[PDB]
Design a protein around this motif. Structure first.
Motif, PDB file in Angstrom:
ATOM      1  N   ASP A 141      -2.736  10.447  -4.227  1.00  0.00           N
ATOM      2  CA  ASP A 141      -1.618   9.820  -3.526  1.00  0.00           C
ATOM      3  C   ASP A 141      -2.049   8.824  -2.451  1.00  0.00           C
ATOM      4  O   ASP A 141      -1.181   8.212  -1.818  1.00  0.00           O
ATOM      5  CB  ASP A 141      -0.740  10.894  -2.874  1.00  0.00           C
ATOM      6  N   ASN A 142      -3.350   8.663  -2.204  1.00  0.00           N
ATOM      7  CA  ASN A 142      -3.798   7.707  -1.195  1.00  0.00           C
ATOM      8  C   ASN A 142      -3.457   6.269  -1.571  1.00  0.00           C
ATOM      9  O   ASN A 142      -3.322   5.422  -0.685  1.00  0.00           O
ATOM     10  CB  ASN A 142      -5.307   7.817  -0.986  1.00  0.00           C
ATOM     11  N   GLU A 143      -3.375   5.961  -2.867  1.00  0.00           N
ATOM     12  CA  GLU A 143      -3.167   4.593  -3.326  1.00  0.00           C
ATOM     13  C   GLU A 143      -2.360   4.610  -4.616  1.00  0.00           C
ATOM     14  O   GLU A 143      -2.407   5.577  -5.386  1.00  0.00           O
ATOM     15  CB  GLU A 143      -4.493   3.864  -3.569  1.00  0.00           C
ATOM     16  N   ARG A 193       0.823  -1.203   0.000  1.00  0.00           N
ATOM     17  CA  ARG A 193       0.000   0.000   0.000  1.00  0.00           C
ATOM     18  C   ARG A 193       0.859   1.256   0.000  1.00  0.00           C
ATOM     19  O   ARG A 193       1.845   1.349   0.736  1.00  0.00           O
ATOM     20  CB  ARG A 193      -0.929   0.006   1.211  1.00  0.00           C
ATOM     21  N   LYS A 194       0.472   2.222  -0.834  1.00  0.00           N
ATOM     22  CA  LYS A 194       1.141   3.517  -0.862  1.00  0.00           C
ATOM     23  C   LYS A 194       0.824   4.295   0.414  1.00  0.00           C
ATOM     24  O   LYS A 194      -0.345   4.491   0.756  1.00  0.00           O
ATOM     25  CB  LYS A 194       0.697   4.310  -2.093  1.00  0.00           C
ATOM     26  N   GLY A 195       1.862   4.726   1.127  1.00  0.00           N
ATOM     27  CA  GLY A 195       1.669   5.523   2.331  1.00  0.00           C
ATOM     28  C   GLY A 195       1.011   4.794   3.483  1.00  0.00           C
ATOM     29  O   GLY A 195       0.500   5.438   4.404  1.00  0.00           O
ATOM     30  N   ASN A 196       1.005   3.465   3.459  1.00  0.00           N
ATOM     31  CA  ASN A 196       0.387   2.660   4.498  1.00  0.00           C
ATOM     32  C   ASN A 196       1.255   1.440   4.758  1.00  0.00           C
ATOM     33  O   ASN A 196       2.015   1.008   3.890  1.00  0.00           O
ATOM     34  CB  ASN A 196      -1.010   2.209   4.096  1.00  0.00           C
TER      35      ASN A 196
HETATM   36  C1  LIG Z   1      -4.100   4.342   4.067  1.00  0.00           C
HETATM   37  O1  LIG Z   1      -5.164   3.599   4.686  1.00  0.00           O
HETATM   38  C2  LIG Z   1      -6.238   4.424   5.160  1.00  0.00           C
HETATM   39  C3  LIG Z   1      -7.203   3.515   5.883  1.00  0.00           C
HETATM   40  O2  LIG Z   1      -7.243   2.225   5.289  1.00  0.00           O
HETATM   41  C4  LIG Z   1      -6.867   5.164   3.985  1.00  0.00           C
HETATM   42  O3  LIG Z   1      -7.922   5.991   4.462  1.00  0.00           O
HETATM   43  C5  LIG Z   1      -5.803   5.996   3.281  1.00  0.00           C
HETATM   44  O4  LIG Z   1      -6.350   6.643   2.139  1.00  0.00           O
HETATM   45  C6  LIG Z   1      -4.639   5.105   2.859  1.00  0.00           C
HETATM   46  N1  LIG Z   1      -3.593   5.892   2.223  1.00  0.00           N
HETATM   47  C7  LIG Z   1      -2.851   6.790   2.883  1.00  0.00           C
HETATM   48  C8  LIG Z   1      -1.815   7.512   2.075  1.00  0.00           C
HETATM   49  O5  LIG Z   1      -3.011   7.009   4.077  1.00  0.00           O
END
Ligand SMILES: *[C@@H]1O[C@H](CO)[C@@H](O)[C@H](O)[C@H]1NC(C)=O
Ligand SMILES: *[C@@H]1O[C@H](CO)[C@@H](O)[C@H](O)[C@H]1NC(C)=O
Lengths: 48, 215, 219
Positions: free
Chosen positions: B30-32, A36-39
């Motif tokens: 950038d979240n994914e 996961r990007k950023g996770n």
């Molecule tokens: C990380 O995970 C959270 C919860 O699953 C999500 O809301 C978020 O968009 C994801 N990406 C980042 C960069 O946090």
């Protein structure tokens, strides 16, 4: 096998915790779920 | 729900650089990770780009991916366009519920033949069809390039926007494009107007054909 | 390599229920995330569902949640999609696809060939065939209108296959009736008319219908 929880750092290296944070080369760990990007996500060691 | 919006069509000439954008409607791009897939005609998709900008082994270096936070978008750049790059391209990411989502897709044309205006033939309902109490006008559009047209039907001067069916342009044997459009009417509808027209617009120019019930 | 072969699917009525199956060759199935993706004719890819290698985690697109159920049997290298409460808008080619460890389970590298699923209330019906009579370049166009058949496909040839130059058979339109129509056209010399005959040979196998229609100039 011990499970790691790893994420991108602040070759490729990941910042991981066991079971306190150690840096592992991405080539030595194996994802157990979608990376996961950023996770963070879970991994195992390549040996195990 | 989140939408990843792409341009419907992009075109370039061999050797040129083209860019395909992918704009996320909600949340942060950038979240994914963003991925890109290529789907050539009649074949299954393959990966071009994954993890925003990584190429699988075998994908040429002229493909590259990038992210632009300020526009909430991802982009696929193809340098040195080659004939085999003619394909549909889809971005792919995931949404707030961790469901994967494809973009709407982009059809990339590699421009490789002379511009050709469409030839339009408008057929009136056949005698046989009218005897069956049906009436179909058939507008056949052939031999054009590039492969994009819009079709408009008129009853006398007035637009007709009911009973119209139109096919997406497809390649002919001679590698030009063709398309077809149908206006379904009642025999009484047919006989009750002085004329019907099919109007075909290609690259800003309009071709028109007209038929009249009085054969 | 890994190859995915879908089976099952087919035709069903709104509210009906079908099961897709996908058999995977190779050695990686037990470690792969497996996905379903569908694509309606002439439309974009739409992600449907995915399942983790240990079957403990599943996800579904909003459009199918509650109606489809994904499952797998690793000992048989097989993926399933149970499609209940079918809707017309579920009509599409459905693809099995693999998300493997080397992508971090993030991308679909291997795709199946696909299996068609058609959801419709329409009944099998053979077409009516009507002639599209011909009217500088000395060139005229003529053709055949193949109206109101179900299901696809229909095939068209001209003069039993001897005529191919200038021939184009269009894709089918799906009308509000639930029935398909298409046309076939051929461009010929204006001089050929009167002396040369033109017959379109229409075949609709689902209804065991074969029609030969002579297309004659009009007046
Ligand atoms: C990380 O995970 C959270 C919860 O699953 C999500 O809301 C978020 O968009 C994801 N990406 C980042 C960069 O946090
Ligand atoms: C790794 O993560 C730990 C915990 O957040 C942090 O203390 C450490 O500085 C990080 N190191 C790097 C190189 O990211």
């Amino acid at each position: 096998c011990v499970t790691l929880e790893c994420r991108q750092v602040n070759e490729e290296i990941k910042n991981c915790s066991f079971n306190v944070y150690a840096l592992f080369y991405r080539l030595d760990i194996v994802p157990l779920e979608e990376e996961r990007k950023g996770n963070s996500s879970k991994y195992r060691l390549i040996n195990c | 729900q989140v939408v990843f919006s792409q341009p419907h069509s992009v075109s370039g000439s061999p050797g040129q650089t083209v860019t395909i954008s992918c704009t996320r409607s909600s949340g942060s791009i950038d979240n994914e990770y963003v991925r890109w897939y290529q789907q050539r005609p009649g074949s299954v998709p393959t990966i071009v780009i994954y993890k925003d900008n990584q190429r699988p082994s075998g994908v040429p270096d002229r493909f590259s991916g990038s992210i632009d936070s300020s526009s909430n978008s991802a982009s696929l750049a193809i340098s040195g366009l080659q004939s085999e790059d003619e394909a549909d391209y889809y971005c792919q990411s995931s949404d707030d519920n961790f469901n994967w989502v494809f973009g709407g897709g982009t059809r990339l044309t590699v421009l490789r033949q002379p511009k050709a205006a469409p030839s339009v033939t408008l057929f009136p309902p056949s005698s046989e069809e009218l005897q069956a109490n049906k009436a179909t006008l058939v507008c056949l559009i052939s031999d054009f390039y590039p492969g994009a047209v819009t079709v408009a039907w008129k009853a006398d001067s007035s637009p007709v926007k009911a009973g119209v069916e139109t096919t997406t342009p497809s390649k002919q044997s001679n590698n030009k494009y063709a398309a077809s459009s149908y206006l379904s009417l009642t025999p009484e509808q047919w006989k009750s107007h002085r004329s019907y027209s099919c109007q075909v617009t290609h690259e800003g120019s309009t071709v028109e054909k007209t038929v009249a019930p009085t054969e | 390599q890994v190859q995915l072969v879908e089976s099952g699917g087919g035709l069903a009525k709104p509210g009906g229920s079908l099961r897709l199956s996908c058999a995977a060759s190779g050695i990686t199935f037990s470690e792969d995330y497996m996905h379903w993706v569908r694509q309606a004719s002439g439309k974009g890819l739409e992600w449907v569902s995915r399942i983790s290698y240990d079957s403990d985690n599943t996800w579904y697109a909003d459009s199918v949640k509650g109606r489809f159920t994904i499952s797998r049997e690793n000992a048989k290298n097989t993926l399933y999609l149970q499609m209940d409460s079918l809707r017309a808008e579920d009509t599409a080619v459905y693809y099995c696809a693999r998300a493997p460890v080397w992508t971090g389970y993030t991308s679909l590298d291997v795709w199946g060939r696909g299996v068609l699923v058609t959801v419709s209330s329409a009944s099998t019906k053979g077409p009516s065939v009507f002639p599209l009579a011909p009217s500088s370049g000395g060139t005229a166009a003529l053709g055949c209108l193949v109206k109101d058949y179900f299901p696809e496909p229909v095939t068209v040839s001209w003069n039993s296959g001897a005529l191919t130059s200038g021939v184009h058979t269009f894709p089918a339109v799906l009308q509000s009736s639930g029935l398909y129509s298409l046309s076939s056209v051929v461009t010929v010399p204006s001089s050929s008319l009167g002396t040369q005959t033109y017959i379109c040979n229409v075949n609709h196998k689902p209804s065991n219908t074969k029609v030969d229609k002579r297309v004659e100039p009009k007046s």
